[PDB]
């Protein structure tokens, strides 16, 4: 009777922003992103792309609680590199990876069939 | 068992481990020693609460 709807995990209702950016006062150049209606699929890709960036000192995510679906990503970069720039370059670098993987998987298919 | 057997097997010593498994009688004596645990837990609670 209290079971939440199945669709409630990936669907946003009125008023919920997808992303919420809040600066972090503990630290200089630290920012904390809040992603609604996402899980470890999306959060883990980005964290692991941020740690390749040598100008990123810290990156990590957590699901605060499993029953509510949101991600919280802290990022701390070096001075004169903004933590919002770090998080955008991460997303464009995956897109430039996954667009290279979808093209290389199509070539191996045609090679595989009758070849 | 034979009358007047005081040996370790007749009087309830179980020489098997739960992994190798208890033999038939050792299973019954092990059940007699566990009943004394269930009974205590049912009796003592009503005294300790009064």
């Amino acid at each position: 009777m209290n079971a939440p709807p199945a669709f409630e995990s990936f669907l946003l209702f009125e008023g919920e922003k997808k992303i919420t950016i809040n600066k972090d006062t503990k630290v200089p150049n630290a920012c904390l992103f809040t992603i609604n209606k996402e899980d470890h699929t999306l959060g883990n890709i980005i964290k692991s792309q941020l740690l390749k960036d040598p100008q990123v000192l810290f990156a990590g995510y957590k699901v605060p609680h499993p029953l509510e679906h949101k991600i919280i990503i802290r990022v701390q970069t070096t001075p004169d590199y903004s933590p919002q720039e770090a998080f955008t370059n991460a997303i464009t670098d995956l897109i430039s990876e996954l667009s290279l993987l979808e093209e290389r998987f199509r070539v191996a298919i045609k090679d595989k069939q009758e070849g | 068992f034979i009358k007047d057997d005081y040996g370790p097997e007749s009087r309830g010593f179980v020489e098997n481990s739960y992994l190798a498994g208890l033999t038939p009688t050792e299973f019954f004596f092990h059940a007699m020693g566990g009943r004394e645990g269930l009974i205590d837990t049912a009796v003592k609670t009503a005294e300790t609460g009064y």
Binding site: M1, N2, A3, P4, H65, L67, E68 | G49
Partner: protein
């Protein structure tokens, strides 16, 4: 809320808590808290008294 489990043997079996509202049907409590109430999770139940 105040939060209880019978029988209450000592006073650590009634302790005030701070509500957080989550789905599904069961009260949920930290595991360190299962020492005072002497409650393991197999079919247990606990009362809730909202002051």
């Amino acid at each position: 809320v105040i939060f209880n489990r019978q029988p209450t043997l000592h006073k650590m079996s009634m302790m005030g808590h701070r509500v957080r509202i989550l789905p599904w049907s069961t009260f949920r409590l930290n595991l360190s808290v299962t020492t005072p109430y002497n409650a393991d999770f197999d079919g247990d139940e606990m009362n809730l008294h909202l002051p």
